[PDB]
Design a protein around this ligand. Structure first.
Ligand SMILES: CN(C)c1cccc(C(=O)NN)c1
Length: 279
C-alpha cells in the first residue's frame, strides 16, 4: 500500500533516504495488534481513529484528553492519515493530567494496569505500549517499565528532550525497554533529543503532524513524537509475524537504517527506524 503526500516521518520510516513523500506499507497495517498509549488520554471520537480507539483507564476525574498530547501520540501510532499502523487497536490510559503532568506513582500504576488489562483483550498479533513521558531517574519507574515489558508487552519509551544523556531519566534509562530518540527531516538528531548508550533507536520527532483534540490536527516536536513511530512500527511488524513483543526492539535495530543521522555523539546508536517494506 502507499499513502501519497504523507507526513514526512511516515515517508521516512519507509525509505532509505530522507526527502521522500510517500509512505509505503503492507496493507495489513497492524490489524490484530493493540497499542496502549499511556499519556493524557485519547480523543477516541476523532474521525481519524475510525472507531479503533477507546479509553480503558483514567487516573483523573475524566477520561477526556483535555491537553492533546496523548491524542497526538495516538495519532502517530494508528490514525488513518497520520499513523504508522493504520489498522491497529488503540487503548488509552490517562496517567497525565490535562497540563501534561503526572506523579510517578500514577505512571507506575498505569504501567501495572496495562500488564494486567492486556490479558482481558483480544490482541492476536500482540501488544505494544507507548510511553511518551518521563522525568528524572527513578528505579521504581524503571522497574515498572521492566515489569510491563516482561509481562509480554513491547514497551517503547521516549528518551527525553534535554539534549542530555538519557541515563539520568526514567523510564528512558531502563535497559529492558525500547528507548527512542528523535530525528528531523534532514536526518539530524533533533536539537532537543537526549542521547547516550541506553538509546535503542531513533524515530522522526521534529515537526510531526498528527491528530489533536477538538477533532483537529497540528505539528509538534519531541521524543514524545518519535516514540509512537516506533510503537506503531512494532505493532505493524508484529502483525506481519516478523517479530514478537520480546524481540521487536532488537528487530527494529537489526533492520534500521544505519549510520545515516548527523550529530550523533560517539557511543550513541546511529539507527533510524525503518519498515523494510518491499512491494
Ligand atoms: C515533555 N518532556 C520534557 C518529556 C517528554 C518525554 C519524555 C521525557 C523524559 O524525561 N523521559 N525520561 C520528558
Amino acid at each position: 500500500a502507499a499513502q501519497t503526500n504523507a507526513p514526512w516521518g511516515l515517508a521516512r520510516i519507509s525509505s532509505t533516504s530522507p526527502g521522500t513523500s510517500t509512505y509505503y506499507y503492507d496493507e495489513s497495517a497492524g490489524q490484530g495488534s493493540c497499542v496502549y498509549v499511556i499519556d493524557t488520554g485519547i480523543e477516541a471520537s476523532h474521525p481519524e481513529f475510525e472507531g479503533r480507539a477507546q479509553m480503558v483507564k483514567t487516573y483523573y476525574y475524566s477520561s477526556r484528553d483535555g491537553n492533546g498530547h496523548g491524542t497526538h501520540c495516538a495519532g502517530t501510532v494508528g490514525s488513518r492519515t497520520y499513523g504508522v499502523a493504520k489498522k491497529t487497536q488503540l487503548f488509552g490510559v490517562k496517567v497525565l493530567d490535562d497540563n501534561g503532568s503526572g506523579q510517578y506513582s500514577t505512571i507506575i500504576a498505569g504501567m501495572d494496569f496495562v500488564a494486567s488489562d492486556k490479558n482481558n483483550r483480544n490482541c492476536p498479533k500482540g501488544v505494544v505500549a507507548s510511553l511518551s513521558l518521563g522525568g528524572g531517574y527513578s528505579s521504581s519507574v524503571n522497574s515498572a517499565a521492566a515489569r510491563l515489558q516482561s509481562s509480554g508487552v513491547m514497551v517503547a519509551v521516549a528518551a527525553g528532550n534535554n539534549n542530555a544523556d538519557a541515563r539520568n531519566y526514567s523510564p528512558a534509562s531502563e535497559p529492558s525497554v525500547c528507548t527512542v530518540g528523535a530525528s528531523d527531516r534532514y536526518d539530524r538528531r533533533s536539537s532537543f533529543s537526549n542521547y547516550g548508550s541506553v538509546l535503542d533507536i531513533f524515530g522522526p520527532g521534529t515537526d510531526i503532524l498528527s491528530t489533536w483534540i477538538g477533532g483537529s490536527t497540528r505539528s509538534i516536536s519531541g521524543t514524545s513524537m518519535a516514540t509512537p513511530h516506533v510503537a506503531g512500527l512494532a505493532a505493524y511488524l508484529m502483525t506481519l509475524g516478523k517479530t514478537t513483543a520480546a524481540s521487536a526492539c532488537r528487530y527494529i535495530a537489526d533492520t534500521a537504517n544505519k549510520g545515516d543521522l548527523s550529530n550523533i555523539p560517539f557511543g550513541t546508536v546511529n539507527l533510524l527506524a525503518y519498515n523494510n517494506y518491499q512491494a
